[PDB]
Design an enzyme around this catalytic site. Sequence first.
Site, PDB file in Angstrom:
ATOM      1  N   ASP F  42      -9.542 -49.018  12.189  1.00 52.58           N
ATOM      2  CA  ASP F  42     -10.458 -49.620  12.911  1.00 52.58           C
ATOM      3  C   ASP F  42     -10.961 -48.423  13.917  1.00 52.58           C
ATOM      4  OD1 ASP F  42      -8.062 -49.516  14.892  1.00 52.58           O
ATOM      5  OD2 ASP F  42      -7.745 -51.494  14.740  1.00 52.58           O
ATOM      6  N   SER F  43     -11.627 -48.880  14.974  1.00 54.93           N
ATOM      7  CA  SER F  43     -12.452 -47.919  16.050  1.00 54.93           C
ATOM      8  C   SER F  43     -11.473 -47.085  16.724  1.00 54.93           C
ATOM      9  CB  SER F  43     -13.431 -48.544  16.838  1.00 54.93           C
ATOM     10  OG  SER F  43     -12.941 -49.941  17.261  1.00 54.93           O
TER      11      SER F  43
END
Lengths: 121, 167, 177, 111, 61, 87, 276, 67, 91, 69, 126
Positions: F42-43
């Site tokens: 993910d980010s």
Amino acid sequence: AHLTRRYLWDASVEPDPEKIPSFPPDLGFPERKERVMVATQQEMMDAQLTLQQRDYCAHYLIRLLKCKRDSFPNFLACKHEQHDWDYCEHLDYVKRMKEFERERRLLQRKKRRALKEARVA
Amino acid sequence: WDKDVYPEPPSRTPAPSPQTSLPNPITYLTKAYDLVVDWPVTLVREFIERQHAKNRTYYYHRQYRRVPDITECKEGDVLCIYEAEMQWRRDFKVDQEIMNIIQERLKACQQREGENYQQNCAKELEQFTKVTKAYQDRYLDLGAYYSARKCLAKQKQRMLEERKAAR
Amino acid sequence: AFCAPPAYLTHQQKVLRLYKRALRHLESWCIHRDKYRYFACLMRARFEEHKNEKDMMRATQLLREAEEEFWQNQHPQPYIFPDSPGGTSFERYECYKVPEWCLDYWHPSEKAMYPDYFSKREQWKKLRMESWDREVKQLQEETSPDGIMTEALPPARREGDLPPLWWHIVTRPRERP
Amino acid sequence: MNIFTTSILLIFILLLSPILISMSNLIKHINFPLYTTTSIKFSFIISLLPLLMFFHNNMEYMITTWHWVTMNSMELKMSFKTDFFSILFTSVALFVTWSIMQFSSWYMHSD
Amino acid sequence: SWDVMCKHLFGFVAFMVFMFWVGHVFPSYQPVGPKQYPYNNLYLERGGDPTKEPEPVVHYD
Amino acid sequence: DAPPLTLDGIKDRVLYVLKLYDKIDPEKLSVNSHFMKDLGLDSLDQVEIIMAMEDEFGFEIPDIDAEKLMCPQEIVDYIADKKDVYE
Amino acid sequence: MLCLGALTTLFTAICALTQNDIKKIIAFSTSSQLGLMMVTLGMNQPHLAFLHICTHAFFKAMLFMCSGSIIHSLADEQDIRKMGNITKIMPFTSSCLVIGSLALTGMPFLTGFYSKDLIIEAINTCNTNAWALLITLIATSMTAMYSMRIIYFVTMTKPRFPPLISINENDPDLMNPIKRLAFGSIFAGFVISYNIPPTSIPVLTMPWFLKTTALIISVLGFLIALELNNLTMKLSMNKANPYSSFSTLLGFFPSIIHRITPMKSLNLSLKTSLTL
Amino acid sequence: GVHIQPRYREFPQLTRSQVIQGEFLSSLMWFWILWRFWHDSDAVLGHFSYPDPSQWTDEELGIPPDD
Amino acid sequence: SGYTPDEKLRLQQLRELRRRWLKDQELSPREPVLPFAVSHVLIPMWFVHYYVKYHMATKPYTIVSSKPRIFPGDTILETGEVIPPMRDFPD
Amino acid sequence: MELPDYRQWKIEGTPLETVQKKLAARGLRDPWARNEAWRYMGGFAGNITFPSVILKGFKWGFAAFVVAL
Amino acid sequence: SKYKPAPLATLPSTLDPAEYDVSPETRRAQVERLSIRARLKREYLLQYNDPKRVSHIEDPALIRWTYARSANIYPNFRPTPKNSLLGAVAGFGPLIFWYYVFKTDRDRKERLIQEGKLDRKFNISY
Ligand SMILES: [Zn+2]
């Protein structure tokens, strides 16, 4: 702890350091003899002892200094001489402590005697 | 130096009294310095002074005849007063190196007598006031335009006082 | 330092740049690695939750209370790296980064030695002047259509051309001479 | 004891020697870090000679080397005192300096 | 915050300065009487006038 | 004092660290493999990756340029470009 | 000066406790020790003050170059936070560092001990500000604390340095001087104290608590610092207390008196004296 | 790589001299502390015993008999 | 985010050029084409001594020294006197 | 310069493991532990005690003292 | 508590409400200002990176600054109050303060010298 007594509990009993011989030597001392300086005012002046170091132990100092110039390469061998000087001085610090305690007590004498005279009348 | 203008006290040295078997690290070194530093130099120096003594020459010290002082000098006569302000500006310096010597003679007498300076060195400091109380009384208030006319007045303002106070 | 600054910041980059300032300011309170690797995976949790909030208003209300929680729970002396702005070696070696247009005033004696060095330097200076025209034209032919201009510069887009304005990103003083 | 005076004046001359070598073109040819480290080393030994003197005899020396201005009443002159504070410190300082210059050669290597 | 800074710094300064005052009021001094120097408190050697003898200051045992 | 980096020693360390991140499979990490579209992270895990690299190589990747260290290679030339490694 | 020397001693020492830069901690210690030196001059004990100057030079010089060795050997890391377990990775500097640390903390029979405890007991025996006497002694315990802070964080802890390791201190130019000063740090107090001329007429007669106060306060200073440092590694987060800030940002004298004075001294020139 | 080669995630190899010189300086520190402690143990004790100021017979100090 | 496909080429290409610049910066072989204590201890010393024993010593009050220390019972070399021994230490 | 096999590193046997187990009670699991393993993995694995540093070399120091004595 | 920006120690970017402002206008200025700076940036970057140039890049924004600060001052001077009251307290205020500081000292000194108290000892210079 002397301080705790002076600052916390009592003010008169404890003496003031600025005036330790608050009382004359004769008190409780008939014909007390005064300290005697062994070294000659000149001896000191010739050994160039710092004014401060010109104490009543100046005489054992001059000895140390003698054995420190002599015995030069060996700086660890004038050891007996240092004990002596120090002792002389410990035996002086004690005096300066005995004088302080004597004052203390004497001032107490004043207090207790104040009450003695303060006897109801 | 004139042992008398720059005095110097006789020397008293305690004699060597070693009380240790060990060998003094100073005496050995000096024995070297004296051979590898002094002898070499000593040799050169002498050779200097013999080079000097061959064509030895001399130099004297200009002695200035004393001219008439402002106290006696016509007013407005720029000639006489000029020769008399110099005679003073000259003694303003001769009376200043004297004070330089007492500045110096003392300095030495407090390095030579440490821890005793308070006492042994009071032959001078009595003099440093016997000389400073005078320098203050003849040269101090004056501006940077110090002139003999003004010392003549600085004095004579006070000669009233040594005459008004006395009276 | 290389890429250009965006005009406004998004929501994301503000959140994701706290995850850095936060975790990195948690390694200044928690020095030992273990305590950190612990007290930090607990941090992500904080960011991990409230990840899918769709309510922007809310999201910008968690962010604005995060950065105040952080400001009051930050370390005065964090761990900032040795060579980064605010660091201990920042710009230390800059006294040795001369700007390279100074080797052009060297005495023909100095440049006499170091011979092949200047043979390659004269090649590169030929490259620079040989393209300024195609470059500036590129920079212009590809100009904005009377619209917002950024500080971004175009790539090459044709063989032989060199990325427009490339003389000072390339040929720049070495970092630690 | 000139050995004392000369020693106090000499430490200054020996330490000034690295300074003017860099003024002349000579330093390019010899190694400045090694040369400077050695001379401070010799300065420390030279400092030791007065230190032993003082200890043996506990005597001081005011040395008026050069006169700078008479300035009328206040004469100004260059004077080095050799009291216990001065020579004890002179020896301690050079020992630390001798330590650091060698450290300096390793630390600033590549400068 | 800046205020918090200005107040805290100066508070420290003041408390210290004050406490130092509480100190001068109540000093710490051992139970020792005054030191005793020989002769007349070294009158002559403290540079006193040789001619004028000082009122003797004697120290008893 | 220490030896200077290389474009293949700044690449073996970058792959090394990432192979020790549990989420990133150690057998599908390939330098041309994007962190968020190909590996899955993910980010928030990009920030964590970059930070590892900032601590493996001892310097700070500016966020504005760190916000893009996607490929596991951009990290290998950006680190090298920032450290002047011409191989 | 007895008073201001005393304030600087603790003020600087308290600031040193939380500083996280190795060179900065040593520098604050340079200031504290001189604060103690200022205190002895203030108590009119000039000769011993000079004695500390000489002994201070040997050990402080050692600790700095010791950190010079750590900083250069590591990739120029000047922060205790990323530096750890130097004791096993680099015993030569760690040995030099603890020798210097104990000298700084006045370990018995080392150069600090010959001069430093003379100064301590001098205080305990003279007539002095009560506030000055109390701060100087806790300043001594703090010197042990920050001394403890350096060795625990810098030397006795799991390593936290960057992963590639390239440490070399073999270079003669590193060891030799560090080795030479270490010999001075071990033997100088012995040599200087016996050789110097008898001076100051010290007071060796004290109640035993005061005679041994320097030794005990130094011992518990480390003792207390040790415990706190250990408590740190307990997976229990501990944030700053209100004072920690006044401690870590140097008492806030830098934050406030460096932004106001240079601002209200330049604003007046441009705006008022120059243009108006 | 020159001198001692670098060690990635490993305990840097140490040269014989590094360890011996380090133990040397520390051991001399301890020999000196122990040698002086034995020869001169007046660092903690002090070689002069404080008198108890409260045991001085009133005769000793000149405390007159009250009245 | 991720680099813009037109910024991963302006960094693609300019990095390629930086690599060539740094290669060119490399020096070719030959590149640099170039076309005893007595010394400072003894020689300086003789001079100093020459100066201290023949200027300073000669001039007045240039090298002054604290009096030597004389203790009780030690002889004075210059005058010959023997400092009287001090009064006996009784204790 | 080769690099030690990534596999070598493992969290068990080090203080990271106990951190690993608690974070686990919470359901969490930190993924970067293994990277932080070589700190505790080997060579630097032994705990360092404060007396050990202060007392380094004391053994021979006293041995030297006795002999001299 | 809450950070409290002072004229110094200003409000950080975060903790600043306006940062948290996304009104259309703000994101219209914030993108309209980059343009001015991008525009100026691409007017510095292809004139400094220009081969064949020897002339001095001028940075006229600095020339507008110096002119504003030493040659555009008196053409924009209008004597008001708060300017002449404050323009006299600054020139004559301390200049009159120190006069009564130096006169009083010099007069104290003179009196004492006149009456005979000032010691002026060992002062042989001035
Ligand atoms: Zn190096």
